[PDB]
Design a protein around this motif. Structure first.
Motif, PDB file in Angstrom:
ATOM      1  N   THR A   3      50.073  85.625 -72.232  1.00 38.98           N
ATOM      2  CA  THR A   3      49.796  84.207 -72.010  1.00 38.98           C
ATOM      3  C   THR A   3      48.845  83.940 -70.855  1.00 38.98           C
ATOM      4  O   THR A   3      48.787  84.688 -69.877  1.00 38.98           O
ATOM      5  N   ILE A   4      48.104  82.850 -70.982  1.00 39.36           N
ATOM      6  CA  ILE A   4      47.168  82.427 -69.962  1.00 39.36           C
ATOM      7  C   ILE A   4      47.394  80.925 -69.828  1.00 39.36           C
ATOM      8  O   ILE A   4      47.812  80.260 -70.781  1.00 39.36           O
ATOM      9  N   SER A   5      47.147  80.386 -68.646  1.00 39.11           N
ATOM     10  CA  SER A   5      47.316  78.961 -68.465  1.00 39.11           C
ATOM     11  C   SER A   5      46.758  78.521 -67.129  1.00 39.11           C
ATOM     12  O   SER A   5      46.796  79.256 -66.145  1.00 39.11           O
ATOM     13  N   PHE A   6      46.203  77.320 -67.123  1.00 39.58           N
ATOM     14  CA  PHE A   6      45.660  76.734 -65.922  1.00 39.58           C
ATOM     15  C   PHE A   6      45.827  75.229 -66.037  1.00 39.58           C
ATOM     16  O   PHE A   6      45.946  74.676 -67.138  1.00 39.58           O
ATOM     17  N   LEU A  52      33.091  76.370 -67.181  1.00 38.56           N
ATOM     18  CA  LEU A  52      33.884  77.365 -67.878  1.00 38.56           C
ATOM     19  C   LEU A  52      35.003  77.894 -66.996  1.00 38.56           C
ATOM     20  O   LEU A  52      34.861  77.984 -65.772  1.00 38.56           O
ATOM     21  N   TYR A  53      36.120  78.243 -67.618  1.00 40.47           N
ATOM     22  CA  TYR A  53      37.214  78.822 -66.863  1.00 40.47           C
ATOM     23  C   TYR A  53      36.698  80.222 -66.512  1.00 40.47           C
ATOM     24  O   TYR A  53      36.215  80.941 -67.383  1.00 40.47           O
ATOM     25  N   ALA A  54      36.801  80.589 -65.238  1.00 42.35           N
ATOM     26  CA  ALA A  54      36.307  81.873 -64.748  1.00 42.35           C
ATOM     27  C   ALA A  54      36.825  83.143 -65.424  1.00 42.35           C
ATOM     28  O   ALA A  54      36.262  84.217 -65.230  1.00 42.35           O
ATOM     29  N   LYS A  55      37.881  83.042 -66.221  1.00 38.84           N
ATOM     30  CA  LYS A  55      38.402  84.232 -66.887  1.00 38.84           C
ATOM     31  C   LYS A  55      38.414  84.110 -68.404  1.00 38.84           C
ATOM     32  O   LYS A  55      38.690  83.040 -68.941  1.00 38.84           O
ATOM     33  N   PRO A  56      38.118  85.210 -69.118  1.00 40.03           N
ATOM     34  CA  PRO A  56      38.117  85.183 -70.580  1.00 40.03           C
ATOM     35  C   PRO A  56      39.544  85.037 -71.107  1.00 40.03           C
ATOM     36  O   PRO A  56      40.508  85.385 -70.426  1.00 40.03           O
ATOM     37  N   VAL A  57      39.667  84.509 -72.318  1.00 37.81           N
ATOM     38  CA  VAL A  57      40.961  84.294 -72.944  1.00 37.81           C
ATOM     39  C   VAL A  57      41.114  85.212 -74.152  1.00 37.81           C
ATOM     40  O   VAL A  57      40.178  85.380 -74.931  1.00 37.81           O
ATOM     41  N   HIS A  58      42.288  85.819 -74.298  1.00 39.00           N
ATOM     42  CA  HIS A  58      42.530  86.692 -75.436  1.00 39.00           C
ATOM     43  C   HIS A  58      43.035  85.782 -76.552  1.00 39.00           C
ATOM     44  O   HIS A  58      44.148  85.272 -76.483  1.00 39.00           O
ATOM     45  N   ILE A  59      42.216  85.568 -77.576  1.00 41.31           N
ATOM     46  CA  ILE A  59      42.588  84.655 -78.648  1.00 41.31           C
ATOM     47  C   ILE A  59      43.161  85.317 -79.903  1.00 41.31           C
ATOM     48  O   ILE A  59      43.950  84.714 -80.617  1.00 41.31           O
ATOM     49  N   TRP A  60      42.755  86.546 -80.188  1.00 45.30           N
ATOM     50  CA  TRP A  60      43.323  87.277 -81.317  1.00 45.30           C
ATOM     51  C   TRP A  60      43.165  88.763 -81.027  1.00 45.30           C
ATOM     52  O   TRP A  60      42.326  89.153 -80.222  1.00 45.30           O
ATOM     53  N   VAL A 208      37.337  85.112 -75.621  1.00 45.37           N
ATOM     54  CA  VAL A 208      36.402  84.006 -75.538  1.00 45.37           C
ATOM     55  C   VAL A 208      36.412  83.303 -74.201  1.00 45.37           C
ATOM     56  O   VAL A 208      37.370  83.394 -73.434  1.00 45.37           O
ATOM     57  N   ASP A 209      35.318  82.604 -73.937  1.00 44.73           N
ATOM     58  CA  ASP A 209      35.191  81.797 -72.738  1.00 44.73           C
ATOM     59  C   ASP A 209      35.595  80.403 -73.220  1.00 44.73           C
ATOM     60  O   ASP A 209      35.297  80.026 -74.354  1.00 44.73           O
ATOM     61  N   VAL A 210      36.302  79.656 -72.384  1.00 44.87           N
ATOM     62  CA  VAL A 210      36.720  78.315 -72.753  1.00 44.87           C
ATOM     63  C   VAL A 210      36.054  77.345 -71.789  1.00 44.87           C
ATOM     64  O   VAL A 210      36.053  77.563 -70.581  1.00 44.87           O
TER      65      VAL A 210
END
Ligand SMILES: OC[C@H]1O[C@H](O)[C@H](O)[C@@H](O)[C@H]1O
Ligand SMILES: [Ca+2]
Ligand SMILES: [Mn+2]
Length: 242
Positions: A3-6, A52-60, A208-210
């Motif tokens: 999980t990731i969250s901000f 952009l959020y400074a960290k990449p997100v694991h989406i799949w 991905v970058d969000v």
């Protein structure tokens, strides 16, 4: 579950969790201004900004075959100081390839290069479009779900509450592949809803970058503000699938 969250109830200048691009600037008053505003206090045209959020997100995850579910909420306001010339161009929430740089401005909202439908973009976006381009439905503004193209697979017209704060909620449920978005104007009570089927594993890369991106028109004075007051995001990726 990975999980990731901000959550930014306010924006702070110098916060290294955010990557600003183009004209995007965080004011001392804690507001994220995606597009430039000239000293005279009026919005500048031909301006493109992203955050952009400074960290990449694991989406799949290809190995386990799992896809993440996610939700994002943010508050913004668009003030259109003049009715003429026509204001442009809007703002958009997007997810795309990591290490991405701003694309074409204007009607492309800083995330596309042309109006073609191309898988290579590997980009998903939820736009809040204020100018009617050739590929656009006549009604503006409108909410739109963009999948590898500025030409939306689906749109929902809405009425702009000039200069008022708008609340947005975008949710994606991996099990049903439904991306549902809502826009609420507390000031008037207006509620808008839009949803569509989106298979993120066929569209986006694994990481991905969000971000958020905004742009003003190419014609003089064809501009408006694109202010963001708060923004939060959360993604959950089941690590296994037995
Ligand atoms: O007048 C503003 C207008 O300028 C051009 O037409 C651009 O293609 C549009 O996206 C919009 O920015
Ligand atoms: Ca447009
Ligand atoms: Mn559009």
């Amino acid at each position: 579950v990975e999980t990731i969250s901000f959550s930014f109830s306010e924006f702070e200048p110098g916060n290294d969790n955010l990557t600003l691009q183009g004209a995007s600037l965080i004011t001392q008053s804690g507001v994220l201004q995606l597009t430039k505003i000239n000293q005279n206090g009026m919005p500048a045209w031909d301006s493109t900004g992203r955050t952009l959020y400074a960290k990449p997100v694991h989406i799949w995850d290809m190995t386990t075959g799992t896809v993440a579910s996610f939700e994002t909420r943010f508050s913004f306001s668009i003030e259109q100081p003049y009715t003429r010339p026509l204001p442009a161009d809007g703002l958009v929430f997007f997810m795309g390839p990591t290490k991405s740089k701003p694309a074409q401005g204007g009607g492309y909202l800083g995330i596309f290069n042309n109006s073609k439908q191309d898988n290579s973009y590997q980009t998903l976006g939820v736009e809040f479009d204020t100018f009617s381009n050739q590929w656009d439905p006549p009604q503006v503004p409108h909410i739109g779900i963009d999948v590898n193209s500025i030409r939306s697979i689906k749109t929902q017209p809405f009425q702009l509450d000039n200069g008022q704060v708008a609340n947005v909620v975008i949710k994606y449920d991996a099990s049903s592949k439904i991306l549902h978005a809502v826009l609420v104007y507390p000031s008037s009570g207006a509620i808008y809803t839009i949803a569509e089927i989106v298979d993120v594993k066929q569209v986006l890369p694994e990481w991905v970058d969000v971000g958020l991106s905004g742009a003003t028109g190419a014609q003089r004075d064809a501009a408006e503000t694109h202010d963001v007051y708060s923004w939060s995001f959360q993604a959950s990726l089941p690590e296994t699938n037995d």
